[PDB]
Every structure is written in C-alpha cells, then in structure tokens.
Design a protein around this nucleic acid. Sequence first.
RNA 1: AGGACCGAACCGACUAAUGUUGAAAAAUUAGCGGAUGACUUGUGGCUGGGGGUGAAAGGCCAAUCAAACCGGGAGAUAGCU
RNA 2: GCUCGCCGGAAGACCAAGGGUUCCUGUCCAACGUUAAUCGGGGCAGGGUGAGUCGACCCCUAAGGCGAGGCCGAAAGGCGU
RNA 3: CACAGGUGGUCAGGUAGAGAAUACCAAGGCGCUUGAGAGAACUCGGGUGAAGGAACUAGGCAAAAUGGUGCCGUAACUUCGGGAGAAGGCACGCUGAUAUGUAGGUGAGGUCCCUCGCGGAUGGAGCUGAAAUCAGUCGAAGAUACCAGCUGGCUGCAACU
RNA 4: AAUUCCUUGUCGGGUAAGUUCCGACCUGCACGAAUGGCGUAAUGAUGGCCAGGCUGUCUCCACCCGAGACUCAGUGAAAUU
RNA 5: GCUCAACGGAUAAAAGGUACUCCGGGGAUAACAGGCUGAUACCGCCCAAGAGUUCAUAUCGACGGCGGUGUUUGGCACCUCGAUGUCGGCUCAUCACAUCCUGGGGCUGAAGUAGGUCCCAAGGGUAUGGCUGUUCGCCAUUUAAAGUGGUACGCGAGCUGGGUUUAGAACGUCGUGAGACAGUUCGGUCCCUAUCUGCCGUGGGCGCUGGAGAACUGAGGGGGGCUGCUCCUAGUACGAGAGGACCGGAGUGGACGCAUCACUGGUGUUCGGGUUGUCAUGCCAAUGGCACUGCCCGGUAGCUAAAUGCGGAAGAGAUAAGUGCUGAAAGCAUCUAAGCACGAAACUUGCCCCGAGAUGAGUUCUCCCUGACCCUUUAAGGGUCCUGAAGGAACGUUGAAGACGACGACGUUGAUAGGCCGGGUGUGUAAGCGCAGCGAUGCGUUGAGCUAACCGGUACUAAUGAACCGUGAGGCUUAA
Lengths: 56, 120, 122
Amino acid sequence: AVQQNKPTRSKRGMRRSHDALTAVTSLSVDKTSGEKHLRHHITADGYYRGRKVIAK
Amino acid sequence: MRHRKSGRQLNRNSSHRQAMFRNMAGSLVRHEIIKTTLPKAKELRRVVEPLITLAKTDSVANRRLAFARTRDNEIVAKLFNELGPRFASRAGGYTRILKCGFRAGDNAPMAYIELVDRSE
Amino acid sequence: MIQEQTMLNVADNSGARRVMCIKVLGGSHRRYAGVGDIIKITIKEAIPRGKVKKGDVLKAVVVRTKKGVRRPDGSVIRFDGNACVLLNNNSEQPIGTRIFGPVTRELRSEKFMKIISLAPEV
RNA sequence: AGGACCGAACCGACUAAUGUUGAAAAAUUAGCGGAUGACUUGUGGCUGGGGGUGAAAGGCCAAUCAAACCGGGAGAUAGCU
RNA sequence: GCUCGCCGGAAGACCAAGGGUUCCUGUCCAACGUUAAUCGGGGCAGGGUGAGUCGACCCCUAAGGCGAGGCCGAAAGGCGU
RNA sequence: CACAGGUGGUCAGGUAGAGAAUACCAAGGCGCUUGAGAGAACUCGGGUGAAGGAACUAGGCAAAAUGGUGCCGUAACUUCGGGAGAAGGCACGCUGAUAUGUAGGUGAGGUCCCUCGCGGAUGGAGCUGAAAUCAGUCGAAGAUACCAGCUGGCUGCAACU
RNA sequence: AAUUCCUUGUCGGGUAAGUUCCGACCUGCACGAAUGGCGUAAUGAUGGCCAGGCUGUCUCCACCCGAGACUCAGUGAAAUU
RNA sequence: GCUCAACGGAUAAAAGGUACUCCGGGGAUAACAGGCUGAUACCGCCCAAGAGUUCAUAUCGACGGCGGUGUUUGGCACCUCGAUGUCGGCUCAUCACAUCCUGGGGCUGAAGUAGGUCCCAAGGGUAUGGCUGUUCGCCAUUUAAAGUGGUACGCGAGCUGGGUUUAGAACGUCGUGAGACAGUUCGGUCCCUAUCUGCCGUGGGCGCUGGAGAACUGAGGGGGGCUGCUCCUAGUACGAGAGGACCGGAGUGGACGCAUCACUGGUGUUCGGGUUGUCAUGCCAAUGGCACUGCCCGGUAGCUAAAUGCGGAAGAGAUAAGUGCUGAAAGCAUCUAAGCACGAAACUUGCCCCGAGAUGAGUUCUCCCUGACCCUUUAAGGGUCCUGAAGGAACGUUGAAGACGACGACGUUGAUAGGCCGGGUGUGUAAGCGCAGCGAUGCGUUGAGCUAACCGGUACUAAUGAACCGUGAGGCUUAA
C-alpha cells in the first residue's frame, strides 16, 4: 500500500524520462495566405488549402 | 469488445444522444455552419445526411418522417423547400468537416461542420 | 440436456409418473444426459398398485428432451418436455410394456430396440 | 369501539450491497417495523457527577461515561520503558 | 435567444428559529470558488429595511425562577410568605 | 467545507388515481462549478438469458416471484372475537343497444300558498352521473406503464400492543 | 429439553442419502411447580425444520446498457519513509 | 508472654470477581506458526516361534533387534508481545514420491477372468450429493482412479465469517455473592488508492560498427502428453463346468485444450412493431418526450456456448526395473569382467507457440549515398558552403488491431472512413386516400413502410503542393 523506503532523485528522474513533450514536427504554410497552420487544420484567418472557408 | 460496431457512445445514454443529435441537426440545417467537437461532427454526418436524402422526394409521408426525426416544422420546411432542390443532383456528401484547433476550456479538438454549398 | 436434480416425466406404463435424475452415468465429472443416455433416477410420484413405488432408486433412459437432438443435415427436434423410460438396474431392459409419445432414432442401438419396437412414432 | 388491520406524511432501524484517507467521526440505495397511541413534535422549565436519569442495555448526562468536563493539589507516584 | 432534460405535497411560494449585509447597482479577478472565469454569497465603493392596524414592547397569567419580613443552616447558603 | 445528512409551522393547480401514494404536467424553479475522448481487465448500479431449477450456501443471503377490484369459496384449532385477504377459482380493455347519459344527485323557469320572505309542497328543463346484460371488436397480452401481499405445514420462546 | 456428558442414545416419520427437525421412550450426568410447572387461540423485522411457486444462488457463465478504470487539458492529496 | 511455621519475623488487625475493564513493562514468559530433539507417530529393514489345507519367508508374522523421515502427539523457550490475524469453506495452485488410476516388469497358494505382493515409473489424470461450522466421519450414487504428504497444518494488503475468542440474554451446574464453566442457546462492524521484489501483458531508448527494407536459421524457452465402453481376432486359448483372455485391429464416448460463428441458440437500451398513463406539436389524423429501454413481442451485424471442427499420437534415440546371447576370472557354472540384443505414459527428439539483447547481438536477398574547401593538441579531430538519397517519422481517413503505446490498410496514381445507389436481412401490410359498418374496426392500394453494424458498387465529403528526421562510400591488424 505504501513505501518502506524513500525512492531517490535518481529513480524519480528515470520514471520521468518518458514525460518529455513532443514538439510539433513541422507547420504547414498556406498556398494563398502564406500563414503557418497545423496540417489539416484551418488558419487563424480562416483559410484552408488556399480557400477562405470561414465567415470571419 | 467493439469488433465491427458502429456509433460512438459519447459518454451519454441513448436518450440524451438522440436528443442532442436532434438539436444539433436542427442547428446545422438552420445555420449551415456550426462549430462543435470533431467526433460529434463525425456522428452529425450520419444524423444529418440521411435527413437531407429524405428531403429529396417531397411527399406528406416524407414530411412526417422528417418531423418525427427532427421535431421542428421550420427545419422540415427548410429541408424540403431549399436543401432538397439544392442537393437534388448530388449523390451523398452533403456536408464537410474542417478541423479548427482546440477548445480553450478543456483542450477538446474542434471542427466546423458545413453544408457543401452554403454561400454565406 | 438432463442433469442431476432435474425432473423427468415417464413415457411408459411402469407406474412412475415423475422421476428425478440423481446421477448422470458415464464418466467422471460428466455434466449432461442427452437423448439415448442412461441416468440413475429416484421415483417421486407413482400410481398406487404399480410395478414400481415411490422412493425407488433405479435406472432410466432419456427418450425426449426440450434441448433436442441435432440431425447430420443440421435440423433440430425439440419436445415440450423431458421424458424417460425406466429400466432394471442389472439388466437395463424396460420395466413397462407400453411406450407413450414419440421417440427419436438416437435410440437406434441394439439395447433400445425394445423401446423402438413399441414406440408409437419413430 | 379498538394500546384493531393495510398504507403515505411523521417516528424508527430488521436484511443486503456500497462506502470505510467516506458525499457523511454512523450515511446512501433497495427492501423493512409503528403509524389515534404506552404516539409523535415545537417553545420554555426542572433533576448535576459517588450525583442525576434509566419500560434496566452499565444505557444516557454536548461526537467523551464501571463514575462527565474545566481549573487546581501537581513537576502525585512510576523498584518500568 | 432557441431547442433539450429534471422537480413540481418540491428541488415551488411564505414564516418562526438561527445568521448578519450574504440584499440591489457600479467596478476588479491577486487570494477564495476542488478547473477557466468577463461570473460569484469573493475584494472595493455607493445605495437599500418608512407602520395607530404586521411582530415585539404593553396588560394578564402557566410550568418554573427570584423572593422584604420569616423558618432553617459552621460560613457559603437552603427553603419559602 | 459552496459537505448526498438534520431543521418547527403555512400554502396545496390539471389528467389518471382511494389517496397529501404514483406517473406525466401548470405556476414557479432548476441541469447539481472540472471537462473532452475511448469504449480493455476488473469494480460498482441495472437489463436479458438456452436446458436444469436451491444441485449454491452455515443458511434460499441476494435476487426472482406475488401483488388491484368484484363475485364465488374458504381448513386444523379457538379465549367464539378470530385463524382470514386462509388456501383456491372465475371475470376484467374499446364500441353500440337496452337507455342520442340508464339508476341516482343538483335543480332553473312556471303554478300555487303564505304569521311574508335569503320563504314551504308542484314541476321538471339544463348540468353531473355510477353499475350491469347483451352484441360486436383489436391485440401474444386489457390490474397492460408507475403503483401494487409470496402461500402452506410441523415446532421452541415470549400471552398480546 | 434454550436443561442429556457418554450422544449423531434407541425406534419410527420425512430424504436416494437427515449430527438438524417431528413423534414416541425414560439410566432426568445435572426438570419441577409464583428465581413458578404444564398447556394454550391470537400476535412476532423472534430460533429450527419441511413443501408449492420462483428464479443467474448454482451447473457455467454469455451478451448488453450506464458510472469509474484508460488517454488528453486544468487543479492537485494521503498514509509511509 | 510467638505454629510471628511464609520460621532474618510488613500491621495489634484483612477475603474474592471482573467477559465492563485500565495503565506501565516483557518474546526475560505461555497460546499460533517457525527453530532444536525425535521419546511418541509413520515408514523401512534383521532373526524366524508360528499362521498359511502339507509348507517359516505366495501372503502374514509373535518374543526381541537396528535405522529412516520430520509427519502426529509431545519436550525445550531460541525468534516474534513499540501486533508474525486463528479453524473450516471459496479462488488459485506448486513441489515430493512412501503410486490412487494408466505403463513396464519378478514372484504367486498365477489353469482362465479377477486378484495379492514386491521392484521401476511422478507424463497426464485423480467424484457429485444428504447430515454437520466442520477437517474427519457415516450414508447415497458414481469413477480408470476418487493417493499420501510438504508448501506460515499454502492461499483474509485474494473472498467469506459458519466455528473459536468481547460487550446482550437464557437453561443445567457450582458458589452466601459478585460471578464462573475447554456445558449448552439465540444475537452479534473483517480497513488499506501497490513504492520495491515477484508475476502476467505491452511499449520507449540504445546497442548489434555506413545506413535502410524484408525473409529467415534456431541457441534457448513455454505449451501438450488423461482415459472409459463397445465390436473383431474369438465363445477361440484356458477351463469338469461356471466362466473366459494375452497380443493385435476398428468404432464410439467422458473430462481437458485450441479455434470459429457455417449451423442450433443467447444477447443484441444503435432495427421494426404492439400497448398503458400523461404532456406536447393550434385541433382531427399522425408523431415525439417521459414513466427501469415505461411494459412487452420479435430481431441484423458483432460477441458468444449449450453450437461444431481439430488435438493428446505414430515414429526414433538413449535407458529404469526386468529378460537374455556369447563368456572368462574360477577347465565347470555364471546377463558381465571384455563384447552383443531387447526393454516403460518417465529422459532427448518428433507435435504446437515464443525465440539473435543468442552482447556468442547470427545468415540470406534487395535498395541507397561516388561535392569542394579551410583548421590545428594529426586524429576513428574540428569547422564553413553545397548537398538531404534509400527509408523513416509525423499528420490525416481509419481496422474483425488496440487500455495508451504498438500493429495492419489507405491519402487523389485514391475504395481508407462517412454518405449515396442496388441488394440482402429484420419487422410484418406505413401514411394519405377510397369503400363497408351507427361505432370500435375491417377490406383495397400493399408483403406495404421503415430498416444499425451486412454484401456489391460509387470519388459526393474527408484523407494536401509541401515541410521534418535520416547523408555525402563507411576504422585498424594480419592473411588469402
């Protein structure tokens, strides 16, 4: 249920070795607007694959 | 065990699921563009596209089926008067899902669902 | 599909009306007696002044089941009740003379020929 | 008529599951007993610790009871750890 | 704002008790809110509670309390007209 | 503690219902201050289940089951009250006729009388309204949902509440 | 026997099989007459036994619906050492 | 002047209960389990009076003797009292062999069937119920068999809580009583979110010496190994009969295991229908919400057992007890000393699965990269520019794959998912309308309407031009 011995800094770090975050590999550039966006996601201005399909 | 099954539970019982998709289909037919979660849009496809397909042949029986599945006479009227004639030459694919980032409150993936020719 | 503790009707004129299976004969840990399988039974109801009497312990053969038999083409014959035919312990011949209700060809073995001969159907 | 019967409110607490660093220092759900009476309940009052009260279980007397709590004798005493 | 769902002898309305500004408006989001918060019973500021008839006070008394003289008791004090 | 608990009194709509039960609703008020996915083991709360039917287990624990109204029928024993809703059996929706709403309740006009009106017999309009027989009829099922006794036998103890 | 050690006493009933139960017996270790004896209809969230019905209790588990478990974002304990 | 006698004499003067209990201690000291021992227990052997129809040793074996185990009852007080939860049951097991069944064999008071006893053998298998808290035991009915023991009398941070071992109460008995009883009776709270070891699964990293994609060898590891009945040989051998085989062959079962969904079914709150009450969509008609999916009736795909396929082997090698052949020591005799031949479910293989982190990191096939300059502690060195291949990864649509990783399919050179069309399956004749009937309702249009996961098709929607990681011929020595 509970420890008998305090685990160490070392074992803490080894357990945390798989906690690293994977940064975004590469952002896609819009062909019309040239904005950077996540692939298959629309741009902040509302573009996607060169077309402005967003009301705003 | 989920082998060859269809439909997402979406962490709801079946009654809440039916009511939610009824409301959401009404909203999509009304506005022609709605922001929702990605899996919800994936299921709204299956809810809304059969309804528009039903709205092709204009008959009293189809009107009553649509009203049974929608419970909104304005939505039924818009379907049979506008979206039937609009999509009458299209074999399915009346809708379009565009992924649009994540929700601030809970990091849920977000998608716009649109009717393929809304012109707004 | 007959287990221990299950009640069976009697399809013969030996006297017993209802009997209870108390051991499924065959091998060890054997679970079920189907049609054509020998069971050990105790008589729970019997007509007065019959060949057998209440409380007797003897052998029987299952001749009808609700679970039914499967035929080689894949058909199933089910019955509305489970019935058996009483037998002597040490000779395995039927106690009674008449057989009531239909039977199946699963009893087409050299030992149950006397049941098949006097059965009204099949 | 009834310390009568079935049964809500209300008063209780027989069984089971849950929960047991609980939602809760005693509860929840499903069932369960009484339910015009020796009933239940509000407001105020009285009984005080070798005392009270007790259809009596050593029960209850502010989550404390084979002798409450607070302060004192008091740094009791401890051939023991 | 529109749909959807729940309570409806209550999860609705109003009192007593208890609380004390939580009430309404403007503003702010450090901390508090088991998350975010533009919101809040949170911080800051200002406002809001109008009685011959409602309640209290008041006049009357119940259980009980206190109790001039009094009886009683080492003192304290107990009982009582 | 912004805590599944406790906290006296008043108000008491509609439909069905004996009902303040229960179901769905009105007025009114809320979705309970983390969410989004996924749809493993296992745990918790439920649904269904072939054949068998207590073989489980310390034990039918827990579950399943019964469950309503009317009529009929109702044992041992008994303190003559009971036991008793003993056990057990039958019927049950909807439509029409009897009878454009029957039996019954209320009762306008109008007649009449009057120690006199807020008046007593007549009258029956309107409104409300069981229950039953017959005939038909739909369903697998008519107490259809919620709600709603399991029954019997032998025995110890304690009269009983 | 809520009382009996030997004891699962003996015989019978009920079960295929009954240390339990029911009835009879009497060698009552160690009943007994208001610390009452023996019966007793009715009552019981009372102990024991048997039967009809019912069933996932079980043979022997299968499938399904929800809440967790698992992953993602936010906040963020504990015993122990 | 002391039975101050507990005799170095507490006081002149003193008994009990606590299960209502308390506090300081002690593993200095009992109960559990462990430890030492092994009287006792169990097993084994030595002698042979005797039993066994004659006959000590087929089978037993008195009087006495010697060991083994650690296994019963005990002995000791070594660990634990600043806590090592007790009996039985359930779930899950694991070893031993002193073998219960199945295999091999010697003897037999072995004619045959059936047995007894001893030796070898631990691969697999190895009851269900009534009674009782039971372990045992008795009984019923089975089976090839229902083995004996160890594992904290295995197994409560896995379940239970019937029994023992609290607090309530009662009977018998004892006691003046409080109470008590290795008597009986009814009732009576079982916490823990797993850090480490272990174990079952599944990933990330690096390594394997230039990188990458596949396909393997197989060192090593795991799984599996049970058996009944019937018929033929054969009513033969044997036997006075009664009975009745060895060896060999065939079929058909029980339990267990793997796979699967064609069948029979279960489930199927995502499909269709019936129906109760109520609210609603202005109303009729029709639908929807809610009441456990309201309650029910069926039922697709998937999952699934009760359903249906398959399996345990044969064979080989080396052997156990055992049987021998030849054969001396020891002219004979002798299975043994040399040499040779058989011999079991046990061992190694053969059967299935994992398997190169097998750091001893293996093998095979294919693919890819073939540019210039500077620098200095000259080396398997550092740096700038060009180049960025094979491939991978990431992202997306996703799966009969999956907790998450992972694994498989697909991304416009496209059937990967949704939709759509056609079919199929399921439910069972929609709505609207017409006709008949007073009406409920019935008939026709109509096997209609609707239909999830299925089958065959179809780019309608969504799977993006890109970017990202991965380099630029790959060390030394010797030898051919």
